Structure formats: C-alpha cells, structure tokens
Write a protein that binds this ligand. Structure first.
Ligand SMILES: [Mg+2]
Ligand SMILES: [Mg+2]
Ligand SMILES: [Mg+2]
Ligand SMILES: [Mg+2]
Ligand SMILES: [Mg+2]
Ligand SMILES: [Mg+2]
Ligand SMILES: [Mg+2]
Ligand SMILES: [Mg+2]
Ligand SMILES: [Zn+2]
Lengths: 81, 87, 185, 129, 208, 150
RNA sequence: CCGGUCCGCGUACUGGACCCAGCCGAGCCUUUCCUUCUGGGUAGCCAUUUAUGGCGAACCAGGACUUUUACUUUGAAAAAAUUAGAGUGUUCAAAGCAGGCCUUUGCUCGAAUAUAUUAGCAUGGAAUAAUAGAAUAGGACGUUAUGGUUCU
C-alpha cells in the first residue's frame, strides 16, 4: 500500500494493534465496581489486579490475581467505571 | 532546462509516473500508459477522447499498480467507494 | 464592586458582579459565591452577531470556580443574552532569559509561554476534556492546531467552539480548530 | 541506544520515498526535526506534515510528493567556517545550481544559500536535494 | 463521474452470486485485501462484488479506447476459460489466445504467432504467468481476472473474481463483452437484453 | 535493551493521555495522602503502595490526584527510606545469592549471577552519589550488606 | 521606466523609476524593559510650593554588578623572502621593481592587494551541545518596609 491515511487508521484495525503500537498508546485495562454476592458495598477494583482484594465488611477474598486480568470469585458481578 | 536567452536547449522532456512521480526512463519497458475512454450521458464511449495515466515499471513490479489506479481513478470520479484512504 | 479584584472596574465588570450578588438568592448555590472574585472581564466580538465574554480569575481561585462553573455559566448566559461565557485564569508568562541576562530565580515550567497557552487551551473547553492535540504544518508556512474533545459533557460547548477559535486567536495569535471526533453524527 | 533522532527521521523519510510511499510516520519528534522538515517543505521537497501530541517526545506524519532524491544528516555536526561551505556543497550536492546543505547557525536553521545571504555560519546539520 | 445507469443492477448481482463469482480463495495476499468484504466461517473469503462491478466497468472503458479491436489480446491457459476467450474474440473482434502461450510470442519477432497487442487481458495471473511476463518487456498494459490468491505483479487493472470456478470465468468474460459492445453502441442501451446467453462462453467436457 | 541480558522485551505500562482524575473519582487529595502514610508504616515500598491503590482504591495515578509522585510525598513527610527501594531489592537479592553461595560452592551459575547483581548495584549507587541521594563516601560492602536489608 | 550620453546585442552609463514581489536590516506593541548607582538635567510629570514639591532614562559620561563554556561573524595581530595576484615591452621569457612624459638645468603614477590560523586579544549572535539555579527552603522582591548583631 503506497497511499494510506496514517493519521486516521480504521478504529477496528487500530484496536487489534499492540497497546504500545497505537498512534497514542492507551491502556486496555479499566476499573470496576464489584458486587460480592454476600453483601452490597461498592469496591473499586482494577481489572488487572495483582492483589487479593477483600471487601471491608467481611474478610472474604473478592478476586485472585492471575497472569493478566484478575479473576472475580463466584457470585461477584462487575460493572466498568 | 533552458539557457540565459530562454531557448529550451532541453531535448526530450520525459514523462513522470502518475503514482510516484518518478521519471519514466527511455528504456523502461515495464512502464505502461493506460488510456481510459470517456463516456457520454447515453452510456456510449466517446471516440478518441480518453483519460490517460502513466505508471513507472517500479510501481508495476511491486504489485501496487492495481491499488494506485484504484486511488487515482476514484479521485478523478472514474470509480466510487472502491479505494479507501484509511486502512 | 467588592467582588472585583481590580481597581476601577468597568461598567461591564460591575454588571457581572451585580449578577454574582444575585445567583446566591437560591440557596442551592449560595454557600460558595461569597468568596468568589474575579480580576477582569475581557469582551470581544465574534461573527454571527454573538460576543465572547472572558472572565479572568486569579489562578489560585480557579479550582473553586470549577465546582460550580457548569451551573453558573448557564444562568449568566440567561442574564446576558447572545453572550458566550468562559472562565480563564490569569496565568503569568515569564520571558525566556537571554544569554547575557543577569541571573534570576529558575523559571518554573508553569510560567512558560508554551505551558500557559496550553493551559488557556484547557480552560476554554472546561466541561469536556482533551483526548488529543495535533498540529498541522501547511505548505504556506502557517501552523494550525487541532484539539480533540471527549463526547462526554459535549452539549455544554457543542454549539460554540467557533467562539473559542477566534478567542484563542485573539489571545495568542495562532490558529486552532476544535473537533469532536466521537459524536453520534 | 537512540543517539540521533534526526538521523532516524530522515532515514524513515528516505526509505518511504525510495519505496514510493506518499506518507511516513516519524517517532520521536523534536524541534530540530521540525525545523529541518520546514526547510524541506519550504523548498517543495515535501508536502504538508502533521505533529501528533502524545504527552511524550511526539510523532510526525510527513506527506511525500516524489520530488525528493535524498535527505540525510551529517553526524557529527561539524563546525563549518564560511570559507568551508563551498567545499561541503561540492562533495554533497549533485550540482552547483540546486540542492541545499542545511546548517544550524546562531541565526537559526537555514540552507546554505540563505546562510550566504545573511552572512552567518554555524555547524553543518544535513542536506536535501 | 458516471451515470446511475452504470450502477450494479439487481439482475447482474443475482448472476454473480449464482455463478459463485463471490467465492474468493482461502488465503488472500496483502495487495487484494481491499477487495475482501468478509471471511466466511468455513474459510472462504467473500468478494465485495460492488467493487468487482466497478472494475468491470473501468476495464471495459480501457478496452474501448483501443482503436483496432484486434489489438486487444484475451488469454486463458486454464481449460475452464478457453471457450470464454474464443467467443469473446468472435464477438468483440479481439485476438484470443487459448491453451498454450508460446514463449517469445511478444519478444521474438520471427515466431509464427508473433503479435504486438496494445493491451493484454488475462484470465488468471498464476496459470497465465508467461503471457503476463512478456508483456512487461514490450510496454503492454495488463488487465487480469484476479482471485484472492492471484498474484498482482505487473497487473494494472484487477477484476476481483473467482478464478477457479467453471461459471465464474464465463460470466465475467460475458459481462465484459456486453459492456464493450454497449460502449461501442452495438447494444442500443444499458437496458436492452443481449441476444447472447452466458451459457455460451462456458467450457464443455468431451461428454456433452 | 536489557542492560544485563540478550532480551528485547517491551512489556511495560502505557500511561493514558489524560492527566486529570477520572470523573468518577471522588476521594480528595488529602484522603489519598493519609492512605499512603497508613500503608507506608506497614512497611510497603512506593511500588507496593501504588499497586494497592489502583488494585483496591481506584487511585489510577497518585500524581494526577495529589499533584506529586509517591516517593515525593514520603520524602515530604520524613517517611522516605534511607536506601532507595530499587537499590534495596538489588542488595537483598545479592544477599540471598551470597548466602546461597556459601553453602553451594560449586554453583558457578550463582557466582555469575552474583557478579551481574553487584555490577548493577555499583552503577546505581554511583548514580545516587552524583545526585546526592547517597553520601559521597557511601560504598556497598559485601561483608556488611546483610545489616542494611535484613 | 528617454538609453540621449557614455562611448552599435549596444546599454555601460545612469535624468526617471511609480518600485511588483523578493532579499539583507532596524526599532515599537502584544503578560516580553541591565535590577543599577552618580550626574547632566532637570522636560514633562502629580506642575496644589516647576528648569523653588517628588520623570535619572528625556541621551550621554562617569560609576556598580555580572553562572561557566563550546560554537560561529567581524576586527587588530600573525616580519621580509616564498605563494596567489594588480601594474610595468627586462628586445620575449625566467626575472626585476621597475618605470613614463618633446627630450626637459625637470615634471611625474608606483613599488598594490590577497592568504596565513592551531594558540592568545577585541567583537556581533544565541541555533546546536553542555553547565548553575527555589526542596528539611539557609529561596526572590520591598525601590523610601522595621529593627538588631557585627565589620569599612
Ligand atoms: Mg441560600
Ligand atoms: Mg513550494
Ligand atoms: Mg569526496
Ligand atoms: Mg547549489
Ligand atoms: Mg532536486
Ligand atoms: Mg527496544
Ligand atoms: Mg552492556
Ligand atoms: Mg517500566
Ligand atoms: Zn462484601
């Protein structure tokens, strides 16, 4: 391809690129509001969390760290902030 | 190229590639000159009246001639929504 | 006139301060208009019959205005019709020292001309946030900025932007173009 | 490591122009790169170019029009006296009638023809033709 | 630009899909990427036939610009395309090259069938590589029917279609012949039904 | 890349373009500071405080909220460690290898790795002396290293 | 733009550009000023008592301070011979710095000018490349801000 709009890449192909290889690098992670099944308390949790986050009310583990995104425990529903 | 008195001492002002603006040499036998007929409102081809493009042999060798014509013809209206600037 | 932080305020500044001593009547926003003050009201004429109204605020007082600016502009636009209201902070620009100039204290970056023009370019579009800036260098020699705004809270500014471009041109002399790439359109 | 961002920028431009591309992306940007590009744009060797702000060194997109034969840096930026400019243009330029040697002088970045006009000299910075 | 009468009509679009023209090869080269609409879950790539139609119209306009109709050479080394190119030459007056292409036909001026076409049209760049290769020696532009795996080297105008289909090859050639005659004025207008049927131009086995 | 390897990995964080706090963030610039000091007294290094902040409190960046980087806040409250955190972890790793080496004398691989870690200590300690983070007479001693980190 | 004249594109000379644009400058304003210090000296401010109240920048000449470089412009300096080079019928030339005039009880062009280059000296500029500065503030301004401790 000799002629191509480098300033306006297709957003579909722009999203398949590595996170450092976009026009402006941008994280693909986000923050979530996690509802444990036991109670109702807003707890902001990073998507790629490295910590076993526990809610303040009961010392129950909300998520377990993995290689990438943290894994939410059963009965826990997340909503992206 | 011309002298001080203004006479064009240059012989053979050469052609240039429509895609890359390179000079098409006198022995570049991979270079072609596309001639495309004009069509009147009746759907008939107008005799002896053409849109002309020239491509250097370099562009044709890389296989970009097809994509260059898609772009060049769309800008001149010979084509619609076939070539996209953004990929 | 106590609202104005400048000696000999103009009639327009008094009228604006007269509005400022009237929006606290409704108690939803009253607990915060007592400390609010401003230094100047610069007004220029934009095309289309509208006029741009620039409220100049002490930089330390900027974050207090940011808490009620969304509401306060809407009623100030009601009180003064055919007026586009923006709030700018009076940042100070320190000239670049010459080589032979006598040594002064090191100039902080917030006082540089590049930072201040970037700062006023940020106060202009306050409800929205800038998600990217580009600068075109045209073949003629002139340079044009492009600022990309977030679609969130876009309705507060989406009918202006043209006032900002001429207002930014008035303050700095350079050309800018505001575009919101992610509208519904 | 990355020792000359101007050399990386011009190399990218050369590779895109030699391969027939009409646009090239440059990273990182700098003032010297922008002022070098402005001289090239001023003489018509490139078209419009665009600066992208990423709260970092930056990126540049240059539009190429096929008139550029070669642009390059001279590393290091040798000190050039006024009497030495003639010798440099002979070695680097294809003819005495076109082409420019780019210098960085205390009067600013400019081509060798402009440098003779304002009678200034500095360090050599690159060339274009 | 172009009159709306040159747009893809629903009748022709039905023909193209029924002839499996839209089926492109599994693997697509980078140069043919703009012509792919979407990949089918089995693996086949769906050809954007709207782009296919416009290249056909563009290609026919180039053919009409050649003064001598015999100076246009239509080629096919595949057996599936040999009947199509022979009938195209009869209808349009072009010069058909079916089957084997003798090496040296364009460069060696003492061969028997030494031709000097102003334009070479190819059914498949892969199986007609010899015809395409010599055209790059004597300044001959090339129009090629290209699949998603067909090479694009020294091809100026590419018609995106299915090269490995019995009906795909015949239909595209029939469409070019009709449009070339429409531009020449042989067909009165773009709505008159053509006498020739796309069944003619289709390869027939020795069984029949 | 990779000063002490042949690796060419590029994995790292990519900061967002926005330098302002997200609209949904409600904590004040103070509440973060008391949170940082509370965690710093538990013994966490600045890296670990930042990990906990985004992981459990939604603090994407401490700088975009408070205005200062995490180590800058600790140094402003007299909570800055004497040894910088990264230099501490290099010395601690060097201590661990040296402790393993005295019991496994034939582990020539650990001897090679120990040289890399210690070379990395000296380059970093020399840098910290030029920026007056360490005293000009500060020197890393293998014999007394266990005192500094243990 | 009379190209008369000067001495036939000629076209140099040059009355006349009316300057198209372009090129080399200089100031002023845009938040952008040697902080100064002593006069001149005071002219206009703040002229209610002036060049009898308080415009030292209203331009000089006499003082006081100053982040360090690198770089580049210009200038002085770098002996003569040699080199390049202007002039000059040593009969030409290599050379030489001679020489030329109607013929002289004397008249009279000259004996240029360039180059030196690292180091040193003076100078314009401030791109490029470094360097210093306000972080436990022991930081900057108060021109006439208030005292105190010392020192000349
Ligand atoms: Mg109230
Ligand atoms: Mg130009
Ligand atoms: Mg050489
Ligand atoms: Mg030249
Ligand atoms: Mg050129
Ligand atoms: Mg790397
Ligand atoms: Mg190494
Ligand atoms: Mg990192
Ligand atoms: Zn819970």
């Amino acid at each position: 391809v000799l002629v191509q709009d480098l300033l306006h890449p297709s957003p579909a192909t722009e999203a398949k690129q590595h996170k450092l290889k976009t026009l402006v690098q941008q994280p693909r992670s986000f923050f979530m509001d996690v509802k444990c099944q036991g109670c109702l308390n807003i707890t902001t949790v990073f998507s790629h969390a490295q910590t076993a986050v526990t809610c303040d009310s009961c010392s129950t583990v909300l998520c377990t760290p993995t290689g990438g995104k943290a894994k939410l425990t059963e009965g826990c529903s997340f909503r992206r902030k | 190229m011309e002298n001080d008195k203004g006479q064009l001492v240059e012989l053979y002002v050469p052609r240039k590639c429509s895609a890359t603006n390179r000079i098409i040499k006198a022995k570049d036998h991979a270079s072609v000159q596309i001639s495309i007929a004009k069509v009147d409102e009746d759907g008939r081809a107008i005799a002896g009246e053409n849109i002309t493009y020239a491509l250097s042999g370099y562009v044709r060798g890389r296989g970009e001639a097809d994509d260059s014509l898609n772009r060049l013809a769309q800008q001149d209206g010979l084509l619609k929504n076939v070539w996209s600037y953004s990929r | 006139s106590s609202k104005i932080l400048s000696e000999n305020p103009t009639e327009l500044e008094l009228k604006v301060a007269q509005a400022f001593v009237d929006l606290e009547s409704q108690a939803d926003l009253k607990a915060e208009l007592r400390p609010l003050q401003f230094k100047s009201i610069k007004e220029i004429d934009v095309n289309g019959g509208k006029k741009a109204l620039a409220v100049f605020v002490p930089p330390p007082s900027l974050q207090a205005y940011r808490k009620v600016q969304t509401r306060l502009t809407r009623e100030l636009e009601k009180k003064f019709p055919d007026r586009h209201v923006v709030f700018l902070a009076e940042r100070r620009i320190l000239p670049k020292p010459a080589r032979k100039a006598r040594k002064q204290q090191k100039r902080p970056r917030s006082r540089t001309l590049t930072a201040v023009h970037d700062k006023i370019l940020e106060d202009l579009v306050f409800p929205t946030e800038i998600i990217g800036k580009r600068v075109r260098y045209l073949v003629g020699g002139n340079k044009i900025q492009k600022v990309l705004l977030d679609s969130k809270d876009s309705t507060a500014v989406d009918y202006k932007l043209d006032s900002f471009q001429q207002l930014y041109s008035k303050l700095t002399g350079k050309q800018v173009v505001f575009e919101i790439p992610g509208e519904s359109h | 490591t990355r020792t000359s961002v101007l050399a990386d920028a011009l190399n990218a431009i050369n590779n895109a122009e030699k391969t027939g591309k009409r646009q090239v992306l440059i990273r990182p940007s700098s003032k010297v790169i922008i002022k070098f590009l402005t001289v090239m744009q001023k003489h018509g060797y490139i078209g419009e170019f665009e600066y992208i702000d990423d709260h970092r060194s930056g990126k540049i997109v240059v539009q190429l029009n096929g008139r550029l034969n070669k642009c390059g840096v001279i590393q290091p930026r040798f000190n050039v006296k006024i009497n030495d400019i003639e010798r440099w243009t002979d070695n680097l330029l294809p003819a005495r009638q076109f082409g420019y040697v780019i210098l960085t002088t205390s009067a600013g970045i400019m081509d060798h023809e402009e440098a003779r006009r304002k009678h200034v000299s500095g360090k050599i910075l690159g060339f274009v033709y | 630009s172009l009159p709306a009468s040159f747009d893809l009509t629903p009748e022709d679009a039905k023909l193209l899909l029924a002839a499996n023209v839209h089926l492109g090869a599994k693997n697509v080269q980078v140069h043919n990427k703009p012509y792919v609409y979407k990949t089918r879950p089995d693996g086949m790539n769906i050809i954007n036939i709207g782009k296919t139609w416009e290249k056909i119209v563009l290609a026919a306009r180039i053919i009409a610009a050649v003064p001598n109709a015999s100076d246009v050479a239509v080629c096919s080394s595949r057996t599936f395309g040999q009947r199509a190119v022979l009938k195209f030459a009869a209808h349009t007056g072009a010069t058909a090259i079916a089957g084997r292409f003798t090496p040296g036909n364009f460069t060696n001026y003492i061969t028997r069938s030494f031709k000097e076409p102003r334009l070479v049209v190819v059914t498949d760049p892969r199986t007609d590589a010899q015809a395409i290769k010599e055209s790059s020696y004597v300044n001959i532009p090339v129009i090629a029917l290209t699949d998603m795996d067909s090479p694009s080297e020294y091809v100026d105008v590419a018609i995106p279609c299915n090269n490995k289909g019995k009906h795909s090859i015949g239909l595209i050639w029939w469409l070019l012949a009709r449009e070339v005659l429409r531009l020449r004025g042989i067909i009165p207008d773009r709505t008159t039904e053509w006498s020739v049927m796309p069944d003619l131009y289709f390869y027939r086995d020795p069984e029949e | 890349g990779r000063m002490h390897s042949s690796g060419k990995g590029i994995s790292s964080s990519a900061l967002p373009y926005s330098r302002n706090a997200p609209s949904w963030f409600k904590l004040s610039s103070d509440d973060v500071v008391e949170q940082i000091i509370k965690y710093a007294r538990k013994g966490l290094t600045p890296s670990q405080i930042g990990v906990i902040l985004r992981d459990a409190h939604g603090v994407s960046q401490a700088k975009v909220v408070t205005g200062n980087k995490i180590l800058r806040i600790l140094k402003s409250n007299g909570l800055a460690p004497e040894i910088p955190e990264d230099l501490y972890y290099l010395i601690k790793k060097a201590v661990s290898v040296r402790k393993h080496l005295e019991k496994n004398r034939k582990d020539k691989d650990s001897k090679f790795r120990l040289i890399l870690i210690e070379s990395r200590i000296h380059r970093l300690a020399r840098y910290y002396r030029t920026v007056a983070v360490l005293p000009p007479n500060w020197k890393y001693e293998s014999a007394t290293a266990s005192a500094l980190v243990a």
